[PDB]
Design a protein around this motif. Structure first.
Motif, PDB file in Angstrom:
ATOM      1  N   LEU A  96       0.834  -1.195   0.000  1.00  0.00           N
ATOM      2  CA  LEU A  96       0.000   0.000   0.000  1.00  0.00           C
ATOM      3  C   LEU A  96       0.873   1.251   0.000  1.00  0.00           C
ATOM      4  N   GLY A  97       0.909   1.940  -1.132  1.00  0.00           N
ATOM      5  CA  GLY A  97       1.541   3.238  -1.185  1.00  0.00           C
ATOM      6  C   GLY A  97       0.490   4.325  -1.194  1.00  0.00           C
TER       7      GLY A  97
ATOM      8  N   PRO B  11       5.923  15.188   9.543  1.00  0.00           N
ATOM      9  CA  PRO B  11       4.495  15.510   9.482  1.00  0.00           C
ATOM     10  C   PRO B  11       3.711  14.550   8.612  1.00  0.00           C
ATOM     11  N   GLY B  12       4.363  13.859   7.687  1.00  0.00           N
ATOM     12  CA  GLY B  12       3.660  12.865   6.907  1.00  0.00           C
ATOM     13  C   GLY B  12       3.409  11.559   7.620  1.00  0.00           C
ATOM     14  N   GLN B  13       4.098  11.303   8.726  1.00  0.00           N
ATOM     15  CA  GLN B  13       3.842  10.097   9.500  1.00  0.00           C
ATOM     16  C   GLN B  13       3.381  10.399  10.914  1.00  0.00           C
ATOM     17  N   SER B  14       4.129  11.200  11.662  1.00  0.00           N
ATOM     18  CA  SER B  14       3.720  11.522  13.020  1.00  0.00           C
ATOM     19  C   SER B  14       2.901  12.801  13.103  1.00  0.00           C
ATOM     20  N   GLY B  15       2.777  13.542  12.006  1.00  0.00           N
ATOM     21  CA  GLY B  15       1.881  14.675  11.983  1.00  0.00           C
ATOM     22  C   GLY B  15       2.397  15.924  12.650  1.00  0.00           C
ATOM     23  N   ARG B  16       3.644  15.929  13.104  1.00  0.00           N
ATOM     24  CA  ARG B  16       4.172  17.032  13.885  1.00  0.00           C
ATOM     25  C   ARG B  16       5.290  17.744  13.141  1.00  0.00           C
TER      26      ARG B  16
ATOM     27  N   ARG C  72      -6.086   5.376   8.974  1.00  0.00           N
ATOM     28  CA  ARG C  72      -5.990   4.108   9.679  1.00  0.00           C
ATOM     29  C   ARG C  72      -5.007   3.191   8.969  1.00  0.00           C
ATOM     30  N   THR C  73      -4.278   2.402   9.763  1.00  0.00           N
ATOM     31  CA  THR C  73      -3.552   1.244   9.267  1.00  0.00           C
ATOM     32  C   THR C  73      -3.280   0.277  10.412  1.00  0.00           C
ATOM     33  N   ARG C  74      -3.184  -1.008  10.049  1.00  0.00           N
ATOM     34  CA  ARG C  74      -2.719  -2.134  10.872  1.00  0.00           C
ATOM     35  C   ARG C  74      -3.388  -2.184  12.247  1.00  0.00           C
ATOM     36  N   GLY C  75      -4.685  -2.441  12.207  1.00  0.00           N
ATOM     37  CA  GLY C  75      -5.453  -2.412  13.428  1.00  0.00           C
ATOM     38  C   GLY C  75      -5.785  -0.982  13.761  1.00  0.00           C
ATOM     39  N   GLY C  76      -5.793  -0.647  15.044  1.00  0.00           N
ATOM     40  CA  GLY C  76      -5.999   0.730  15.437  1.00  0.00           C
ATOM     41  C   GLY C  76      -4.732   1.557  15.401  1.00  0.00           C
ATOM     42  N   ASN C  77      -3.931   1.406  14.348  1.00  0.00           N
ATOM     43  CA  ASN C  77      -2.737   2.224  14.181  1.00  0.00           C
ATOM     44  C   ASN C  77      -3.166   3.461  13.417  1.00  0.00           C
TER      45      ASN C  77
END
Lengths: 166, 37, 544, 338, 78, 134
Positions: free
Chosen positions: A28-29, A143-148, A46-51
């Motif tokens: 998944l890209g 910011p693209g992953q942790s949003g900060r 959302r990804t990998r359960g509640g991730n």
């Protein structure tokens, strides 16, 4: 995005006749969310359960770190002048990791005048920004992953390390 | 310069549209006497 | 060949475009007998006269070899000639033609009848070449031709020739950026020579391009007038030793008539001078009737150049402002020889683009006519302005009089144009609002006049039909007078204003809605306008 | 009755604003008009319906049917877009922020091709069918839709071009560069015809021209900048111009005419926060359209007085002017509600 | 047309089959929420005011409050 | 003016029926006052009355017989008498059709003579209004 698999491309031997497979879920890209400056909007994907993953697009309140004392304080964003992971990325003025962006350094002025008394030992080419207001600082957080938007200030060696470049 | 500027011919766009004969409502003489200067 | 093609296709499109002679109405009208015998029964032309005598060979062939016996033909196969409007509005036909004709009506008939449109160099040729097709312009039925007619056409300019080409960098439009055109006041400019009369014939071609029809005094009675001058564009060039004329406009002047107009009205010739005829018999004027006239005959612009086509009206207004500021192309003789007193006006033939040119002209129009003509859709409304500004009271009085006449003229033409009505009201407002100031104040809510014009029941009916659910037929008794009263004495944008003008012209709500927006949209705009009118009348009845 | 903002003796209305009893008197025109927190670019097709609005995160295509007042689909395209055009109805061509070009069809995604450098603008030619794409550098490319070839790319100046447009009635190719030169090419000759330079009187910093436009008379040319300064141009004394400083002045991005409806000689300018509208031959503001958020770009629907923006908020704003014109046939009770 | 009417505080509701459509024509081109008078729908109920609250047409299809376009259209709902 | 272009005799019959209803029902209640002086001066123009005198001593062409004809027909159907030809002239100016249509349909005899009789009735009305107000 598209993919993450070696099946669409050639290996270190030069093979052919691929025609392999319908691509699975775990290749998944997602789309490249080029984070910019705006009003703070983070998409909660959302990804990998509640991730839950925070995909930031228009973040402002960067926590940038005074280096010699390690004081991560809150400020705004101006624009990235040099980032040759894409030389059009600085033409379009986005905000990604390891970019060198400009900051109005007024709370750093407040902290210096608050824990030293007087106003202006620190280097001269960053003392010029202590006077003027806009200092260079490089983003650490994703910011693209942790949003900060976290980052570290430029102080001396790293300053000239980028100023000789551009 | 690998994927950079492949001067090839591509299959679905070879007849994606179709031209027009008269085209510009002006004349080419109107072009010449439009921007002589 | 066109007869065979139109007999085998009814499809077939022929245009007979004459130049000065020898093919205008005869051969392409005689090219219908094979259709009228073998394939058609619904023939229907639309000429005034001399069309059956033009197709006398077709008529004689039908009377002697295609029918066993003017008026419409028969079999024992009708040929119903009509007007242009009835030809456009009633043709379920197989053959139709109208020689020497006024072309949107003939375009309106192209449904099933064979296209044969003919005329004796106008915008009909442009509309025929811009549609989506044969063109008849050929030699005469003679071996070499006529040398007598060749001499007469050399002396009268019966034929035109485009000569402009891009023979330099400063030829097409490098000069056409700040070209301030000059004048030409040679009173014997048509003296017989090669070069000067060649340039005069080229100026005649550029003057008779996009002009009116093929008249008899096109280059034979206006060539020998008293002071028939012209201009020539493309002034700013010094790379060569020549010149051409891209703006050959015609002006004239005649008496200044402070005694002469009154003497002519005594001599029963009160429509003597074109300036002091409609202004002198409109409201019995004094100063504009005492002045003389300097008007225009045929304007001209660029049917060739784009930039000069944009700048032609500006060059015409600049020539008027320069007037109100042997062969010698000069503009310095009329620096002292360009004098007048009050003779500065014109009259523009009623087209929408022509009224737009009159608004860019801003010299304003008085009134066109009452009805239509057999060669003109409407008469030329008189334009007027001057630079030495002194006739402010005369201009404002004429503008208020003409605006009251137009806003009261409900059923003057009864099939008029709402866009031309908007242009007329705009020229009226511009003329009355730019002299110095409008020295005639509007109706400032005289509540006695409000209670005099509309009564209590009309007031409450307008208020109820605005503030509640009623009908346009339930409140359209006052829809005529309130429109003129609002236009004379708030705000209405060009949709609501056109709707108010349509209601004042008493067209139906559906009849204007089928044209412009829609029934629901037009009714909502009428409801908003009635709400605004009830608001202003409620403010009047609340203040008094 | 929707509320109206104050202006110079004129009224405008917004539908689908940031603020737009209200729940039970809702005035919603187009259902599902909201994106994922921003908006890229909106434009309305040549026919009377089918407006297209590009996406923001997981960017989409979002074709709205005007005769159904809602959404048709959302093709989640592969990358984030900057510029596209529409080629009548169903076909359309797009280019993303990376140097790739998508061809959407009725089935969607007919092809994905590329250009060698990062692109910034795209236009299509109605005559002989070659799309011109402006990018970074010496390079203004062609993709002809006749035979799918490539064409001999137009040699530019150093930095590049922000916007390319061709003239409609005669075809004069504009290319708004960085060094104030406008670089008019000829779509017939494949060569330059002029290198017009843009001037001012303030001269803050070396501005770059970002917006180019023409109209359907073929004689004037609307020019922009990176400073908030509109410009007009003609061939008639082509060295000066008329200029329009704007009261905030960051970067004007959309300058479009009113050349097909009434109330003529009027033009819309649009920079990052405000979009105004003024008259030709004086340079005086007819109205303005101040929203509550910034503007990514705008568009104006033909035949009537309505505007559609793409902004940085969740919905898109539509702006109705009941003095410029009416509301169209599919919105034909907007004049009944307000 | 049939007119469903509801007096909510007393808890009453009844339908009335009103023919003679020029009585009906007061409601025409008035969307949901805008009020009305009793005076132009009837004479025997004067001084009456009704807030409209939708209605199924023939073919049974409902109207949702405040969109546009008084014909039928195909939207996306729950 | 908008959507009643039916007849002349039936229009006169309808106006007479409405005035007959008013006269039978009213005693002196809905008794209207005549055309006041300054109000009648504001309703026409002074140059419009000059053109009315030009029709009185000259031709009655549309340069002075169309701008004032609406107020003429309004005051004529308001309120001091009219003939049959003059009544058809007042109704013809109210229906606002042109000259050769209405009179040539109804009377079908002496077209220009009836137009001159209409001009004479207009001159009598203009002379009465002028000699009353001014």
């Amino acid at each position: 995005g598209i993919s993450r698999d070696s099946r669409h491309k050639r290996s270190a031997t030069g093979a052919k006749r691929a025609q392999f497979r319908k691509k699975r879920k775990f290749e998944l890209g997602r789309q490249p969310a080029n984070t910019k400056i705006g009003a703070k909007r983070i998409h909660s994907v959302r990804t990998r359960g509640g991730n839950k993953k925070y995909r930031a697009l228009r973040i402002e309140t960067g926590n940038f770190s005074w280096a010699s004392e390690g004081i991560s304080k809150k400020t705004r964003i101006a624009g990235v002048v040099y980032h040759p992971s894409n030389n059009e990325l600085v033409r379009t003025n986005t905000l990604t990791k390891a970019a060198i962006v400009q900051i109005d350094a007024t709370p750093f002025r407040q902290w210096f005048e608050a824990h030293y008394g007087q106003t202006l030992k620190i280097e001269s080419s960053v003392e010029s920004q202590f006077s003027a207001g806009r200092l260079y600082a490089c983003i650490s957080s994703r910011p693209g992953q942790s949003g900060r938007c976290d980052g570290y200030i430029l102080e001396g060696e790293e300053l000239a390390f980028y100023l000789r470049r551009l | 310069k690998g994927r950079k500027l492949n001067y090839s011919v591509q299959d679905p766009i070879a007849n994606y549209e179709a031209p027009i004969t008269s085209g510009y409502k002006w004349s080419d003489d109107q072009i010449d006497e439009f921007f002589a200067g | 060949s066109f007869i065979d093609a139109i007999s085998e296709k009814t499809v077939a499109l022929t245009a007979g475009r004459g130049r000065g002679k020898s093919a205008a109405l005869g051969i392409s009208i005689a090219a219908a007998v094979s259709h009228g015998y073998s394939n058609i029964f619904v023939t229907s032309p639309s000429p005034e006269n001399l069309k059956t005598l033009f197709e006398f060979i077709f008529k004689g062939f039908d009377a002697l070899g295609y029918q066993e016996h003017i008026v419409r033909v028969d079999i024992k196969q009708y040929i119903v000639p009509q007007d242009h409007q009835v030809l456009g509005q009633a043709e379920l036909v197989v053959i139709d033609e109208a020689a020497a004709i006024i072309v949107k009506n003939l375009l309106g008939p192209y449904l099933v009848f064979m296209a044969s449109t003919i005329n004796g160099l106008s915008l009909k040729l442009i509309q025929q070449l811009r549609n989506q097709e044969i063109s008849l312009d050929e030699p005469i039925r003679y071996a070499p031709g006529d040398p007598i007619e060749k001499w007469l056409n050399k002396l009268l300019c019966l034929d035109v020739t485009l000569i402009k080409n891009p023979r330099f960098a400063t030829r097409g439009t490098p000069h056409p950026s700040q070209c301030n055109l000059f004048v030409v006041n040679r009173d014997t400019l048509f003296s017989y020579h090669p070069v000067s009369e060649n340039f005069l014939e080229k100026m005649m071609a550029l003057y008779v391009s996009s002009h009116y029809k093929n008249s008899p005094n096109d280059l034979q009675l206006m060539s020998d007038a008293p002071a028939h001058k012209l201009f020539v564009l493309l002034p700013p060039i010094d790379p060569k030793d020549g010149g051409r004329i891209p703006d050959p406009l015609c002006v004239i002047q005649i008496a200044g008539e402070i005694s002469k107009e009154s003497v002519r009205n005594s001599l029963s010739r009160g429509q003597r001078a074109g300036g002091d005829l409609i202004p002198w018999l409109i409201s019995q004027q004094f100063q504009d009737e005492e002045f003389a006239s300097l008007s225009g005959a045929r304007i001209v612009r660029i049917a060739t150049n784009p930039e000069y086509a944009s700048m032609g009206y500006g060059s015409r207004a600049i020539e008027l402002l320069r007037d109100y500021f042997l062969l010698l192309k000069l503009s310095e003789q009329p620096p002292h020889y360009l004098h007048y007193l009050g003779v500065s006006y014109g009259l523009t033939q009623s087209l929408h683009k022509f009224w737009k040119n009159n608004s860019f002209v801003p010299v304003y129009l008085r009134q066109t006519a009452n009805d239509l003509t057999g060669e003109h859709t409407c008469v030329m409304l008189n334009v007027l302005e001057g630079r030495e500004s002194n006739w402010l009271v005369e201009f404002a009085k004429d503008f208020r009089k003409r605006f009251l006449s137009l806003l009261s003229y409900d059923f003057h033409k009864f099939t008029a144009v709402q866009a031309l009505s908007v242009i007329e009201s705009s020229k009226k407002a511009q003329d009355l609002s730019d002299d110095e100031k409008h020295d005639n104040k509007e109706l400032t809510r005289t509540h006695l006049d409000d209670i005099f014009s509309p009564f209590d029941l009309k007031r409450l009916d307008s208020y109820s039909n605005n503030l509640l659910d009623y009908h346009v037929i339930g409140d359209m008794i006052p829809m005529l007078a309130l429109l003129y009263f609002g236009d004379k004495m708030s705000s209405v944008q060009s949709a609501i204003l056109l709707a108010i003008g349509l209601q004042r012209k008493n067209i139906d709500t559906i009849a204007k809605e089928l044209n412009l927006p829609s029934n629901q949209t037009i009714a909502m705009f009428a409801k908003i306008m009635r709400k605004m009118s009830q608001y202003f009348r409620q403010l009047l009845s609340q203040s008094i | 009755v929707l509320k109206s903002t104050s202006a110079n003796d004129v009224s405008v209305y917004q539908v689908s604003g940031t603020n737009v009893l209200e729940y039970q008197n809702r005035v919603e025109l187009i259902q599902d008009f909201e994106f994922s927190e921003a908006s890229n670019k909106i434009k309305v097709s040549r026919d009377g319906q089918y407006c297209m609005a590009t996406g923001t995160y997981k960017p989409q295509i979002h074709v709205y049917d005007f005769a159904n007042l809602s959404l048709k689909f959302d093709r989640h395209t592969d990358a984030e877009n900057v510029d596209f055009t529409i080629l009548s109805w169903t076909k359309s061509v797009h280019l993303q922020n990376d140097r790739s070009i998508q061809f959407q069809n009725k089935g969607g995604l007919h092809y994905t091709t590329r250009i060698p450098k990062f692109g910034r603008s795209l236009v299509y030619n109605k005559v002989n069918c070659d799309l011109y794409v402006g990018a970074s550098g010496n390079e203004l490319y062609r993709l002809n839709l006749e035979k799918g070839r490539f064409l001999n790319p137009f040699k530019l100046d150093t930095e590049g071009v922000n916007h390319v447009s061709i003239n409609e009635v005669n075809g004069l190719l504009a290319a708004g560069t960085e060094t104030n030169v406008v670089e008019f090419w000829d779509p017939r000759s494949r060569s330059r015809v002029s290198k017009l330079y843009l001037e001012n009187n303030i001269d803050n910093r070396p501005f770059q021209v970002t917006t180019t436009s023409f109209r359907n008379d073929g004689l004037t040319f609307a020019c922009g900048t990176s400073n908030g300064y509109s410009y007009i141009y003609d061939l008639r004394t082509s060295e000066p111009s008329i200029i329009k400083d704007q009261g905030y002045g960051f970067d004007i991005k959309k300058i479009i005419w009113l050349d097909n409806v009434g109330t003529e000689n009027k033009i819309v300018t649009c920079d990052k926060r405000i979009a105004k509208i003024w008259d030709r031959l004086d340079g005086k503001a007819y109205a303005s359209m101040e929203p509550s958020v910034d503007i990514n770009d705008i568009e104006h629907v033909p035949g009537t007085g309505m505007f559609f923006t793409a902004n940085e908020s969740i919905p898109m704003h539509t702006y109705y002017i009941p003095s410029l014109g009416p509301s169209p046939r599919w919105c034909s009770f907007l004049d009944s509600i307000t | 047309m049939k007119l469903n009417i509801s007096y909510p505080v007393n808890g009453s509701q009844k339908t009335f089959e009103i023919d003679d459509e020029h009585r009906i024509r007061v409601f025409f081109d008035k969307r949901i929420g805008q009020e009305v008078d009793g005076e132009a729908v009837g004479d025997e109920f004067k001084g009456y005011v009704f807030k409209i609250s939708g209605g199924n047409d023939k073919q049974g299809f409902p109207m949702k409050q405040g969109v546009l376009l008084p014909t039928r259209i195909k939207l996306l709902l729950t």
